[PDB]
Design an enzyme around this catalytic site. Structure first.
Site, mmCIF file in Angstrom:
data_model
loop_
_atom_site.group_PDB
_atom_site.id
_atom_site.type_symbol
_atom_site.label_atom_id
_atom_site.label_comp_id
_atom_site.label_asym_id
_atom_site.label_seq_id
_atom_site.Cartn_x
_atom_site.Cartn_y
_atom_site.Cartn_z
ATOM 1 N N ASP A 1 -5.025 -3.812 4.789
ATOM 2 C CA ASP A 1 -3.536 -3.363 4.900
ATOM 3 C C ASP A 1 -3.704 -1.817 4.587
ATOM 4 O O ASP A 1 -3.539 -1.300 3.489
ATOM 5 C CB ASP A 1 -2.762 -4.103 3.608
ATOM 6 C CG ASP A 1 -1.458 -3.801 3.718
ATOM 7 O OD1 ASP A 1 -1.089 -3.018 4.650
ATOM 8 O OD2 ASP A 1 -0.859 -4.425 3.039
ATOM 9 N N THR A 2 -3.507 -1.391 5.772
ATOM 10 C CA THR A 2 -3.138 0.082 5.613
ATOM 11 C C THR A 2 -2.091 0.705 5.063
ATOM 12 O O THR A 2 -1.931 1.795 4.597
ATOM 13 C CB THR A 2 -3.374 0.840 7.172
ATOM 14 O OG1 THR A 2 -2.242 0.216 7.935
ATOM 15 C CG2 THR A 2 -4.450 0.488 7.691
ATOM 16 N N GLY A 3 -1.022 -0.210 4.845
ATOM 17 C CA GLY A 3 0.207 -0.018 4.112
ATOM 18 C C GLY A 3 0.378 -0.235 2.696
ATOM 19 O O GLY A 3 1.185 0.092 1.995
HETATM 20 C C1 LIG Z 1 5.637 -2.612 2.071
HETATM 21 C C2 LIG Z 1 4.376 -1.702 2.014
HETATM 22 C C3 LIG Z 1 5.031 -0.187 1.628
HETATM 23 C C4 LIG Z 1 3.631 -2.031 0.863
HETATM 24 N N1 LIG Z 1 3.133 -3.350 0.973
HETATM 25 C C5 LIG Z 1 1.944 -3.656 1.920
HETATM 26 C C6 LIG Z 1 2.332 -4.232 3.010
HETATM 27 O O1 LIG Z 1 1.275 -4.467 4.052
HETATM 28 C C7 LIG Z 1 2.703 -5.969 2.702
HETATM 29 C C8 LIG Z 1 1.582 -6.808 2.453
HETATM 30 C C9 LIG Z 1 1.868 -8.373 2.245
HETATM 31 C C10 LIG Z 1 1.633 -9.277 3.240
HETATM 32 C C11 LIG Z 1 2.228 -10.560 3.200
HETATM 33 C C12 LIG Z 1 2.762 -10.901 1.919
HETATM 34 C C13 LIG Z 1 3.092 -9.789 0.860
HETATM 35 C C14 LIG Z 1 2.691 -8.518 1.261
HETATM 36 N N2 LIG Z 1 3.331 -6.572 3.835
HETATM 37 C C15 LIG Z 1 4.601 -6.650 3.872
HETATM 38 O O2 LIG Z 1 5.569 -6.810 2.763
HETATM 39 O O3 LIG Z 1 5.040 -6.974 5.098
HETATM 40 C C16 LIG Z 1 6.209 -7.761 5.372
HETATM 41 C C17 LIG Z 1 6.914 -7.314 6.730
HETATM 42 O O4 LIG Z 1 6.023 -7.998 7.784
HETATM 43 C C18 LIG Z 1 5.807 -9.235 7.055
HETATM 44 O O5 LIG Z 1 4.620 -9.446 7.269
HETATM 45 C C19 LIG Z 1 3.889 -9.731 6.288
HETATM 46 C C20 LIG Z 1 5.103 -10.156 4.812
HETATM 47 C C21 LIG Z 1 6.237 -9.213 5.677
HETATM 48 S S1 LIG Z 1 2.786 -4.437 -0.780
HETATM 49 O O6 LIG Z 1 2.185 -5.685 -0.328
HETATM 50 O O7 LIG Z 1 4.190 -4.183 -1.202
HETATM 51 C C22 LIG Z 1 1.605 -3.564 -1.771
HETATM 52 C C23 LIG Z 1 2.056 -2.473 -2.629
HETATM 53 C C24 LIG Z 1 1.294 -1.697 -3.355
HETATM 54 C C25 LIG Z 1 -0.058 -1.816 -3.291
HETATM 55 N N3 LIG Z 1 -0.645 -1.151 -4.223
HETATM 56 C C26 LIG Z 1 -0.573 -3.027 -2.753
HETATM 57 C C27 LIG Z 1 0.335 -3.707 -1.737
#
Ligand SMILES: CC(C)CN(C[C@@H](O)[C@H](Cc1ccccc1)NC(=O)O[C@H]1CO[C@H]2OCC[C@H]21)S(=O)(=O)c1ccc(N)cc1
Ligand SMILES: [Cl-]
Ligand SMILES: [Cl-]
Ligand code: NA
EC number: 3.4.23.16
Lengths: 99, 99
Positions: free
Chosen positions: A25-27
């Site tokens: 996860d690059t995000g």
């Molecule tokens: C929202 C970003 C700024 C940060 N997120 C990483 C992100 O890649 C998450 C990673 C992730 C993935 C699945 C479930 C929860 C979080 N993806 C996500 O929320 O994507 C949402 C939009 O598209 C959907 O597909 C995935 C869920 C939806 S995060 O999971 O909240 C997170 C925040 C801080 C850290 N240190 C580690 C991870």
């Protein structure tokens, strides 16, 4: 490896002696794993994303094997809906985004 | 380009004639932008992230430039903490993960 993004970039990791699957996860700034025990000291942290914040345990200097590549760094442990390998460990395996 | 991950992978996007910054996020299924006006009708969608779910507006077939590459696809609008480019548009610009 070259990983296309037609589907989620899920890989096999080894942490704490356990094999798990995790999302590259690059995000994500940090690496966060679902609840498990890890050795050594920890401190509490809040981490925020879509939907708000969760409370986690921060463990430092933890080794993780990521698709056969070793990395050491901080690992957060808490009620994440999926295991996530974030940039702090992606850098260490030399991961880049290319287009 | 080849983008390393020592810093957040932020790029310039252009949507509705406006430049914005967004995060290239391989852990996002879906592209989501902070509140703004877009043309056409929208559909409901629930997005689940680290901290729980949010309601968003789903707009389809939106023209968006990402780091100078043209994409046309689904953009969600809602209270994301940061603009995120997800895999639905990363595939359109030919992005891969490499290590
Ligand atoms: C929202 C970003 C700024 C940060 N997120 C990483 C992100 O890649 C998450 C990673 C992730 C993935 C699945 C479930 C929860 C979080 N993806 C996500 O929320 O994507 C949402 C939009 O598209 C959907 O597909 C995935 C869920 C939806 S995060 O999971 O909240 C997170 C925040 C801080 C850290 N240190 C580690 C991870
Ligand atoms: Cl670290
Ligand atoms: Cl609604
Ligand atoms: Na430690």
């Amino acid at each position: 490896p070259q990983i296309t993004l037609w589907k989620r970039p899920l890989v096999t990791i080894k942490i704490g002696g356990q094999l798990k699957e995790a999302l590259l996860d690059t995000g994500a700034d940090d690496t966060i794993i679902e609840e498990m025990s890890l050795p050594g000291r920890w401190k509490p942290k809040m981490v925020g994303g879509i939907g708000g914040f969760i409370k986690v345990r921060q463990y430092d200097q933890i080794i993780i094997e990521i698709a056969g590549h070793k990395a050491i760094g901080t690992v957060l442990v808490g009620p994440t809906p999926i295991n996530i390998i974030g940039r702090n460990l992606l850098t260490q395996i030399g991961a880049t985004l290319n287009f």
